[PDB]
């Protein structure tokens, strides 16, 4: 009964052809050329980049990369705190086709070593304050050829940073305006190996990022593209929430003025000072702010949204913050590590405490516990999901790959929903 699948509509916008990095690099090659657009802003100490910066910057690595000898067999680690200048090397190798896998930078030694022992990198790129357990991890896993440092300008401690690794590869006359990205089978090449929450590593084909492309500028689904758009995020970039809201957010021309660490003054002093329209917060920063008092104390009056995306809040928590804040609610979704990103999203303008609707390109049922079978309206079951940006599979482990994503391709999420007869999806 097609009646009990519940399907997304239409994309607002129709899909777009090509890899991740020919979307990424065609939309900030155009912000690149108005001068003054500004991709990240660092909310610690005030710096700005802007997208002709970024898209310069990124530009240079992917060809610098190329020249050293990446190409589609190969993977990077990305490791570092929330900064100015993660997102360049995962820019650089979307745009030639190399994996990049980012590694938690509060992982113990222990499990970052696991991380890496499951991406298998050939170069790392660490934050300065990471060096010290790469190296130790190195001497484990000698495919780690080479290690760049990436908030540095000179050489730091005897490695090379992006810029003096740019600089030691890039042919003479490079102009980073003639670039031309990769082509390469967007279902076949691996765009990112993410960490499942021992952790797994999730390898996702650079399709399941086009699709969020397409969300994430979707006026239902995602934001509407308008000028001066400021986000605030102070999500980890290294996990799905943060990697891929970023991605789309810079496919967006968007500011994304980061923190890498919670403060609470700081981070409200932020949203008014930046005019942030829109914020996001892990889970727990929820119950957070539902304690704040000081939400009262500074001008809000532009901030539109708060978004908790993958992660499910109590339909109480929700309602909380939402009052303080003076906002009719929360922009909820639902998703996973192995979905990509929000899967479920609550539309825009548009039910507490629903998790939202079905994205377009997929399709979400409940069914019975016991039996599998596909479940009607207002019944609670276990949420399946079917899409492509489901994962290709966790990375050398075809066995809990098949323990949860079936042979009609459905992802078996664990969690208990119900839809109602609006199509608004309940986490129970």
Known sequence: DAKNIKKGPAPFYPLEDGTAGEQLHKAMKRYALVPGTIAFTDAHIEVNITYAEYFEMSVRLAEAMKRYGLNTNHRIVVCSENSLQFFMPVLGALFIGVAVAPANDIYNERELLNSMNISQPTVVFVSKKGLQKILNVQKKLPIIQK????????????????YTFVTSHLPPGFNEYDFVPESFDRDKTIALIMNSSLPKGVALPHRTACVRFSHARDPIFGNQIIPDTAILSVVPFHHGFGMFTTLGYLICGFRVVLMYRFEEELFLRSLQDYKIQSALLVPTLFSFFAKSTLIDKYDLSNLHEIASGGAPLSKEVGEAVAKRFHLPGIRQGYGLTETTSAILITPEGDKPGAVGKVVPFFEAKVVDLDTGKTLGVNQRGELCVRGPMIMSGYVNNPEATNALIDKDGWLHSGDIA?????EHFFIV
């Open 147 to 162: 290690i760049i440092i990436m908030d540095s300008k000179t050489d730091y401690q005897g490695f090379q940073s992006m």
């Open 418 to 422: 119900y839809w109602d007869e609006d």
